Symmetry: C5
Subunit: 306 residues, 5 copies
């Protein structure tokens, strides 16, 4: 939080100490008494601004939407267990057939993470970077851009997947219709999880609810630039009986009320190590359909037999 | 929120400054002292109205019902992956057969969004506008209005869908019974999601719970038209030691307590870009069952082979 | 809320103005000073009763159980899509066979709504009213009451349903075993939703948690019959510096703290237009298995073909 | 709550009135002034103990775990609809075969409710009481106790169930493999619901979180034995201007803060009428597989035919 | 909580009594008056630190993530019911075949619990301890470490499982394709539950949200080392009218605000008796596929027959 509060905090340190130096050195004595009345006014009536109430529900919606995206991580490990076993063949066709199926299922999640996450988007700026990272063969790029559509194209590989499995069934690679439908029902589970992330980016927390909660924090501490001044102890106002030149508890109070504001900036749109997550789901999925197709260990007895 | 608070806010600015001009220019000195006693009374006892408690749970129910409708967006991308692959045929019959199936599944969500959303309803005022936008052929409109029913008719295409797939199976287009049941089980998932939006419009947040929370905000600031007046500083009441002619912190306090009231007016009934969402789900679904039926890219090797 | 607060509110108006007339006209001057000490005592120490804390969680459980019953509305539209297509036959047997299946599935929800809802129970007082409304033939009523069971009998039609579909399969009306199991798996989804409403009536919010929250509201305002009196302004107590003869902010405070109590009486047991919901689910379900069995519109081309 | 607060409440009535009689009759006048200083100290500084904050989240976890167990009630009505229809046979074997299947599915929930509920455990103290109540034949008791296992044995009938259905399939009682798998997939739903109750008893709310919230209530009112004393009105302390000999609002404040503590004792471990629930699920399940196997009513026409 | 608060509590007892002894014995009388002004300053302005607000939501996220992991306990009892019945064979091959399937399904949860739980990790430090506990034969360890992968390897047995069942089907041990797919669909449910625990360890509660809530507790009671001092009663400050040498209510206030901090340290990463849970899921799963394959009790009549 110290990195996120290097900008807004030191402005508030600067905006306080400016006004503190102006009051102590620049104002005439007749004009200081004008400042003392506004300082007593803004100290008692800045509690009318519901800072703990407005900011309290905005964290209850940034985070309750933040947690709903980590049940939305598309793991290919459910399709991987069924492509590895059912799509038969050890020759260079069926070995190529299984690697293509688990490459489309990962491409159906890279094309959505490069529109919701800046970390993936700086790894894959254009579509040419997807080809050079092995997620798309050059012959698939020509078919990807003859399909003229002004919308997002993350649904392209999840239709190529389901058309390849049926083509795989009609050549005898998948045995029955039930084993074919078992793959397609696990495609549409990963299509739902990828379909959530597209739905969460397109449906943000509304602008009407963000512009409210950023005034309630800033207009509070705008009044605290005046209402938290150390007044003159010679006038002996009730409450300001001591001069200390640094408001310790005001700067702590700005640290937390603006702290949740900078936290909720972060958690409204996460994924700002998906560079690691994509490198896992590609390296595992191609591993478990090529090296582990029928390579099983040897069946032997356990330590509990008779 | 500034657009939503152009009406209620400037009335409250007008209702304050009217009474402020009446007290400062119209009341006699004997009658001003009558006003000063009511101003001190309504300042101390307007805190008895639980504004932060009544409004606190109404936002907890407008929004917790608002978020439950965005898991209810009917996406056709689960039926689209199975109509594209299983319903065989490249001739002009099966090409027409697949386009009809994905047109009924989109029509089973336009007919529910034109009764829950004013944006869709101004795009489709009558049923004639649905025909001219290609969602319904003219021969389907005659069958749509011989079915005499006083209720909503959004369930009509989702029965025409399931009767067409079985007619498609009996002509040999779908291979097995499992692949037929795989389509119908994914119909009834989109029928459940469309069934939620019909259930959410018919079950609103009750009138007994809205009429409570709109008195608690308005009757508070009705007392704040009197209890927040800048009194005469010559009388030297405790608290009103300064005249400033504009209550800054009261107008901020009205900005947030009526702010959540106008936000909860918006989020109790959302969809007031479904004009874009309908144009996506029609343009994608007809694309992936006509241009992408067996048009697959050429299988080649990846960048990780040996 | 005005209809629900016609009884408890006017008692509280009467109980206040009685004591206000007794203090102003009946008590002797020596006995008025005894009343002034109890009024100051009950004004400062009635804040010890946690009204906003006890009532705050009871609304958090009435409503969080209220919202869980509207995902429990049994819609027959999932069984209707599969009875309409799979149960073949156009003769007067299979036409009678499909209407019987969708009549048992609606009877398996009327028999549970006539034990959880007073609105349905006044429409169907006895079992004879169910026969005259067409939900049960007279020959089914004799079989319904030879089954001797002291418990609820809402599970009777959902077993008659699953025994009729298997009898329908053995006569050749349903084609395969998968299409039979597709109907029975959608029966057991509607059996779960009807099974929730039976579980919610049998498991109420406990008596130990309702008797707490109805003392905390009533014993608060029992003290507010004394602690909110307008005292004599001649004695000049701190706080009671003005006589106004009507406590406006106390009557508003009773309007909301007893307001949530009457709201939570309503939402602990909803359905007190299920007379419309039953008339929809019967009129739609019999419509879509008799008039819409194989009556499909004519396949023609859309407005986007070449 | 009056039954649950007969023990802790009257101790607090006794502990108050003891100290009240000691202060008024036993202490010397010099020693009373020592007591008056501690009474003023414990009145102002007992508000530092966060009673409304510590107890506020413990109710938010007792009840949020309490409500998650009533979606965990194992209803046999999903298996009952499939055993009644698919397991064929009207002779004394298949009649015995269906009754055994629905008896194992109820025994797979009695053996878990006799370890989580004291009400079931006093009905079934040992395993011999299960035999005499008809839930287990004497020949099944010998096989139940040759299976040597130090853990809980509630999973024993749910494996005997799935081994009997496959034995039923190999004798021709169940027709296809899909109808066999339809029973086993509905077994594993009731195995999950019974698996929740075993998981909820084994994972309690931790001891580190219960010992916190029982100090915060008791150490508060331990200070309220001193801080709520009616002091001497002759000394004229601020606040204690009246002697009344019974603290009405303190005893109400103890009624609710200890009220939620006794409520959360009840709802952390419910089921302390499962004697009725077990008698329902046995009497219904054996009824709907013996009297209602193919006993259907006669098909006749409804009141809406032509 | 007493064990968890042996470290931080006695430091706070020591840090208080140090400053209390310094003020009472070391400071000069002119320097004591400097301390009295800071004690009055830190007593009134330490309430500006939102301790009950910052810590209130951190418990709402530690625990709401804590409860979501106990629906994530991988129970093998759903696969166990289907391996026991469908994988046929009583000879020493099929007896070895069923024990291997339920050993891979337990190994697919030990390899994830030895990276998320320190209790399992001290039981299984290296992979050699897994072999000596019977969870992995020595021939499986060579195949486990030829699969070169820098990521976690918990997905290895859940692919060996699905490759063994298909190898079991092609030798005639499993009858149909539906019974094969019934096992694989229950594998991918246990793969999802094991997939949650890997997702919960990799996605912790962020460092930006923990470093906030540990300053708000500690910087509060850092000021309470000064603001809670018993001042000199001879100076007669308002509030400090009594010397007692031990702040009872401050030490209680530190007991709960730091109490939730130490509780949330525990519940952010639970499983710190999984040594019992692993010993159950191995001893039960191998028991119900070897001793209970077709060993059923003898079918006899119940106590309710005619």
């Amino acid at each position: 939080i110290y990195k996120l509060l290097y900008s807004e905090f030191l402005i508030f340190i600067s905006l306080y100490f400016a006004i503190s130096l102006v009051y102590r050195l620049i104002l005439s004595e007749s004009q200081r008494l004008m400042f003392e009345k506004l300082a007593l006014y803004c100290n008692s009536y800045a509690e009318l601004i519901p800072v703990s109430f407005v900011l309290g529900f905005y964290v209850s919606l940034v985070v309750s939407r933040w947690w709903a995206q980590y049940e939305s991580i598309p793991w290919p490990d459910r399709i991987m267990n069924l492509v590895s076993c059912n799509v038969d063949g050890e020759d260079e066709y069926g070995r190529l057939l299984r690697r293509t199926l688990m490459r489309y299922s990962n491409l159906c999640s890279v094309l959505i993470l490069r529109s919701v996450s800046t970390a993936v988007y700086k790894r894959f700026p254009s579509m040419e970077h997807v080809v050079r990272a092995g997620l798309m063969t050059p012959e698939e790029h020509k078919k990807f851009e003859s399909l003229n559509s002004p919308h997002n194209k993350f649904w392209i590989p999840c239709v190529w997947f389901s058309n390849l499995a049926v083509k795989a069934r009609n050549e005898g690679r998948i045995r029955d219709s039930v084993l074919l439908q078992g793959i397609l029902n696990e495609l549409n589970t990963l299509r739902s999880q990828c379909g959530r992330l597209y739905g969460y980016d397109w449906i943000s927390i509304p602008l009407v609810y963000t512009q409210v909660v950023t005034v309630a924090v800033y207009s509070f501490f705008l009044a605290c630039l005046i209402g938290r001044q150390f007044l003159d102890p010679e006038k002996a106002y009730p409450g300001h009986e001591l001069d200390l030149f640094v408001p310790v508890f005001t700067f702590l109070q700005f640290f937390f009320y603006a702290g949740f504001l900078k936290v909720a900036e972060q958690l409204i749109n996460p994924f700002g190590e998906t560079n690691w997550l994509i490198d896992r789901n590609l390296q595992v999925s191609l591993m478990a359909v090529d090296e582990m197709h029928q390579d099983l260990p040897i069946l032997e007895k356990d330590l509990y037999w008779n």
